[PDB]
Amino acid sequence: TIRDEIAGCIEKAYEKILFTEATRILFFNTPKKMTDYAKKRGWVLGPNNYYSFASQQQKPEDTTIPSTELAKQVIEYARQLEMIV
Amino acid sequence: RPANHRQLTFEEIAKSAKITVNEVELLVMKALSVGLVKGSIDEVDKRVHMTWVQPRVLDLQQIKGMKDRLEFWCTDVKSMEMLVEHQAHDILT
Amino acid sequence: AVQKVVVHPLVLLSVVDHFNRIGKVGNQKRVVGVLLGSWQKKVLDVSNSFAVPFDEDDKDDSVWFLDHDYLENMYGMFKKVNARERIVGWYHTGPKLHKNDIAINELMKRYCPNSVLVIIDVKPKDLGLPTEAYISVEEVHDDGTPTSKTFEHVTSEIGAEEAEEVGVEHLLRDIKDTTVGTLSQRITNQVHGLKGLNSKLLDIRSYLEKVATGKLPINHQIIYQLQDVFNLLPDVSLQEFVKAFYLKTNDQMVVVYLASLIRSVVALHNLINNKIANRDAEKKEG
């Protein structure tokens, strides 16, 4: 549960890390567990470095889940102000 | 290009029209003078921005894209309107 | 030209009773009558209307009758009783317009310079807005059509008058859910979505129908033109159209703090008055 704890917190701002410090922290000096992490995980086994890929959200379409959750919420405001029985 | 991410740069203009760099501005402002384009121009990248396309004769694939995208809009409007109506229907009553 | 026409309820009821006039012959007869009004402005006004004899048979279906003399003497009557009132056009029942529905206007253009028509529906299955009105103009085409003389619609509604308010608003007595405020518009808020849907259903049905029949109808000018108008304005972009939503937060802001502050205080003050008059009459009652 610490092995997958490093394998969870790897994906953060370790934008590049040299391999033998990950050998120190993870465990197992030159294992096939480096194949396990570098293949079951991402962190492309390049030259002496687990490389960090990039991913984005953009908040593009939504704009609409804001608009429809506001449809829900203001239909609710109007609904409770609406009541009369 | 399907009119969504269509901001054109200098290169494809100078590649299609096969004219040099300092003539594409004349080329686009001539069409802006005529009015068979309704866009605008940045020149840090020489991106000529597109807010326009010409109405063109409906072909068979244009027939199909017409019906398909028109239905695409119609069923979305219907499916959201039904949810609005049903969500606030019983307070109308 | 015309801004819009203003139809009063009296002429529409004057069409309904006219259908009741000719509902006993039954066999094959559309409702056709003559429209009266007042050219007020670029907007148009409608006050009165009346009948006309008209028939149409099956073989050589261009057989149509407009009595000039009926028009002469009965317009003499209506001009004799009211000089403010004069002719503005004509009407008929209008399921739709058929091919023979140009010759009526082409007769009575020598009475009104712009003889406007009104298309209604006596059968209120229309969940749209009745009293359609066209006007005939010319649009002479790039293909070298000599003269295309086409009716074109100018928008319409039902207007108001002080006495007809008394009339209509007493003749209803039927339905009033409005309590005009935040909810007098929500029934019509269902209506605007649903009645964009009906029109769009007509659109998709027409688009599917032009490919099958009409032999190649497809509208040939105003399909690609107004279709590209459609295909030039669904803005779903995401650069600052996202950034209208702190103005949406500002829209929320004012009403949130007005409600939260003043609503609670007013209801509380009324609780104060109620509980004072409750306990101070309780100590006198019990």
From Swiss-Prot, chain A:
There is a cross-link at K32 (Glycyl lysine isopeptide (Lys-Gly) (interchain with G-Cter in SUMO2)). Signal peptide: none annotated. It comes from the Eukaryota. Component of the 19S proteasome regulatory particle complex. The 26S proteasome consists of a 20S core particle (CP) and two 19S regulatory subunits (RP). The regulatory particle is made of a lid composed of 9 subunits including PSMD8, a base containing 6 ATPases and few additional components. Interacts with DDI2. Interacts with TASOR. Component of the 26S proteasome, a multiprotein complex involved in the ATP-dependent degradation of ubiquitinated proteins. This complex plays a key role in the maintenance of protein homeostasis by removing misfolded or damaged proteins, which could impair cellular functions, and by removing proteins whose functions are no longer required. Therefore, the proteasome participates in numerous cellular processes, including cell cycle progression, apoptosis, or DNA damage repair. Belongs to the proteasome subunit S14 family. This is 26S proteasome non-ATPase regulatory subunit 8. The gene is PSMD8. The chain holds residues 266 to 350 of 350 of the full protein.
Swiss-Prot record, chain B:
Disulfide bonds: none annotated. The modification N6-acetyllysine is found at K15. Component of the 26S proteasome, a multiprotein complex involved in the ATP-dependent degradation of ubiquitinated proteins. This complex plays a key role in the maintenance of protein homeostasis by removing misfolded or damaged proteins, which could impair cellular functions, and by removing proteins whose functions are no longer required. Therefore, the proteasome participates in numerous cellular processes, including cell cycle progression, apoptosis, or DNA damage repair. Component of the 19S proteasome regulatory particle complex. The 26S proteasome consists of a 20S core particle (CP) and two 19S regulatory subunits (RP). The regulatory particle is made of a lid composed of 9 subunits including PSMD13, a base containing 6 ATPases and few additional components. Belongs to the proteasome subunit S11 family. This is 26S proteasome non-ATPase regulatory subunit 13. It comes from Homo sapiens (Human). The gene is PSMD13.
From Swiss-Prot, chain C:
InterPro entries: EIF3F/CSN6-like_C, JAMM/MPN+_dom, MPN, MPN_RPN7_8. Coiled coil: none annotated. Component of the 26S proteasome, a multiprotein complex involved in the ATP-dependent degradation of ubiquitinated proteins. This complex plays a key role in the maintenance of protein homeostasis by removing misfolded or damaged proteins, which could impair cellular functions, and by removing proteins whose functions are no longer required. Therefore, the proteasome participates in numerous cellular processes, including cell cycle progression, apoptosis, or DNA damage repair. PANTHER family: 26S PROTEASOME NON-ATPASE REGULATORY SUBUNIT 7, EUKARYOTIC TRANSLATION INITIATION FACTOR 3 SUBUNIT F-RELATED. SMART domains: JAB_MPN. GO terms for cellular component: cytosol; extracellular exosome; extracellular region; ficolin-1-rich granule lumen; membrane; nucleoplasm; nucleus; proteasome complex. There is a cross-link at K176 (Glycyl lysine isopeptide (Lys-Gly) (interchain with G-Cter in ubiquitin)). Component of the 19S proteasome regulatory particle complex. The 26S proteasome consists of a 20S core particle (CP) and two 19S regulatory subunits (RP). The regulatory particle is made of a lid composed of 9 subunits including PSMD7, a base containing 6 ATPases and few additional components. Within the complex, PSMD7 interacts with subunit PSMD4 through their respective MPN domain. Interacts with TRIM5. Residues 5-140 form the MPN domain. Does not bind a metal ion. The gene is PSMD7. The modification N6-acetyllysine is found at K200, K210. This is 26S proteasome non-ATPase regulatory subunit 7. One of its GO terms (biological process) is proteasome-mediated ubiquitin-dependent protein catabolic process. Belongs to the peptidase M67A family. One of its GO terms (molecular function) is protein homodimerization activity. Keywords: Acetylation, Isopeptide bond, Proteasome, Ubl conjugation.
